[PDB]
Design a protein around this ligand. Structure first.
Ligand SMILES: *[C@](O)(C(N)=O)[C@H](C[C@@H]1CCNC1=O)NC(=O)[C@@H]1[C@@H]2[C@H](CN1C(=O)[C@@H](NC(=O)NC(C)(C)C)C(C)(C)C)C2(C)C
Ligand code: NA
Length: 182
């Protein structure tokens, strides 16, 4: 049952964080590497579970032509490594059924939100930035769900970034994002 996978991910890979931009869900992917929504704009340090943590390095991810993907990769000065979940990230972006959004912020503590089908949306204007590889679910997402992890059928497929009051939008994850070979 999928709540099993979602729980595992919540406890081993998902952290509450705070930046100067607000409260977000962060996904640790492997080693000291984590992913956030670009608009969290992490600086030199970040609150992770109410402890101050140094960011060694941060990169705003782009597609081949330099278009925004609305994701930032951070290298954290943490003591222990995240369980490697890269094998749960698909190589290519595909639609999925029966997805759950796994969220954990001060505004939205540990919650599992069934969002249904997640499908490729593509081009989005995000606060005036052209953005590629977005996906959509027919769920009215709200304040404090950003960084929320989209999971379906043992797969980690997106990071929640926005909503229009009716639908919710995530930045797709691909395995190649955590790997220099792809
Ligand atoms: C997120 O930052 C958070 N902290 O929860 C938030 C999630 C939104 C808020 C209400 N419902 C949600 O799912 N994301 C944002 O506020 C993003 C952020 C800025 C605008 N934005 C939006 O979601 C806006 N709508 C929007 O961009 N709609 C699309 C184009 C995605 C259909 C808005 C009007 C503030 C809710 C940026 C950088 C995209
Ligand atoms: Na969140």
């Amino acid at each position: 049952p999928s709540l099993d996978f979602a729980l595992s991910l919540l406890r081993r890979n998902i952290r509450q964080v705070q930046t100067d931009q607000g409260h977000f869900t962060m996904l640790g992917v492997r080693d000291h590497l984590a992913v956030l929504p670009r608009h969290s704009q992490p600086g030199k340090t970040i609150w992770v579970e109410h402890k101050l943590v140094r960011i060694v390095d941060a990169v705003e991810l782009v597609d081949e032509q330099g278009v925004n993907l609305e994701l930032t990769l951070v290298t954290l000065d943490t003591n222990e490594k995240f369980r490697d979940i890269t094998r749960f990230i698909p190589e290519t972006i595909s639609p999925a059924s029966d997805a759950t959004l796994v969220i954990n912020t001060e505004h939205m503590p540990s919650m599992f939100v069934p969002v249904g089908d997640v499908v490729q949306y593509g081009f989005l204007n995000l606060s005036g930035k052209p953005t590629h590889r977005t996906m959509m679910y027919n769920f009215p997402t709200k304040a404090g769900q950003c960084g929320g992890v989209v999971t379906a059928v043992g797969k980690v497929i997106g990071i929640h970034i926005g909503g229009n009051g009716r639908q919710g939008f995530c930045a797709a994850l691909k395995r190649g994002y955590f790997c220099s070979e792809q």
